């Protein structure tokens, strides 16, 4: 039994926590949908 | 059928993912449901389009989300974590550089059951879904968007 339940509206929130960095990465995407790093 | 963000549950119950209802179509990542039918109350949602390489699937109609990261602005992950209320996390995306062009990427590492959570631009439009990515031990998610 896979089922869904509403959890909220899709909205931007002005007072959201802010975190995370912004890496620039070379990647490849294979037939299975898997990303891998490339050098 | 109401527009919004939804938990994807399986049966005790476990949250396996998240998705977006928009314009009567439910959008999530292929690896969350593997294309299985979904229950919604007394109703049933059947898969309509899916693609393993994009890791995306839509139910009840074709993929509707088409906004894209602008490459410059901060975005918000509308995370729906297992056992917790929906919560916005703001971030500046990095970039996946691929031979077919650049994809925005968010360096946020949340539980597997948040896969399918929408990433939003400042206008509130869904620019992609969270949960297919790479490890650099820190996970980085592509901002995965389909085609409308």
UniProtKB/Swiss-Prot annotation, chain A:
Region (Interacts with and activates NS3 protease): 4-39
Membrane topology (UniProt): Multi-pass membrane protein
Intervals, Cytoplasmic compartment: 1-39
Subcellular location per the Swiss-Prot or TrEMBL entry: Host endoplasmic reticulum membrane
Stretch list, region Disordered: 8-30
Subunit organization: Forms a heterodimer with serine protease NS3. May form homooligomers. Interacts with human SPCS1. Interacts with non-structural protein 2A.
Domains: entry comment: The central disordered region transitions to ordered by binding to NS3.
Function field: Required cofactor for the serine protease function of NS3.
Protein known as: Serine protease subunit NS2B
Protein source organism: Zika virus (ZIKV)
């Amino acid at each position: 039994d896979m089922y869904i339940e509403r959890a909220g509206d899709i909205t931007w929130e002005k007072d959201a926590e802010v975190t995370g960095n912004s890496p620039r990465l070379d990647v490849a995407l294979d037939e299975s949908g898997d990303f891998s790093l490339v050098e | 059928t109401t527009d919004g963000v939804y938990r994807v549950m399986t049966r005790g119950s476990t949250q396996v993912g998240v998705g977006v209802m928009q314009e009567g179509v439910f959008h999530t990542m292929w690896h969350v449901t593997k294309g299985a039918a979904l229950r919604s109350g007394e109703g049933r949602l059947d898969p309509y389009w899916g693609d393993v390489k994009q890791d995306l699937v839509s139910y009840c109609g074709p993929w509707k989300l088409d906004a894209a990261w602008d490459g410059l602005s901060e975005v918000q992950l509308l995370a729906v974590p297992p056992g917790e209320r929906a919560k916005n996390i703001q971030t500046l995306p990095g970039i996946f550089k691929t031979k077919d062009g650049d994809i925005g990427a968010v360096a946020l590492d949340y539980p597997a059951g948040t896969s399918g959570s929408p990433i939003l631009d400042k206008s509130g439009r869904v620019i992609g879904l969270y949960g297919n990515g790479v490890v650099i031990g820190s996970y980085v998610s592509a901002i995965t968007q389909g085609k409308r």
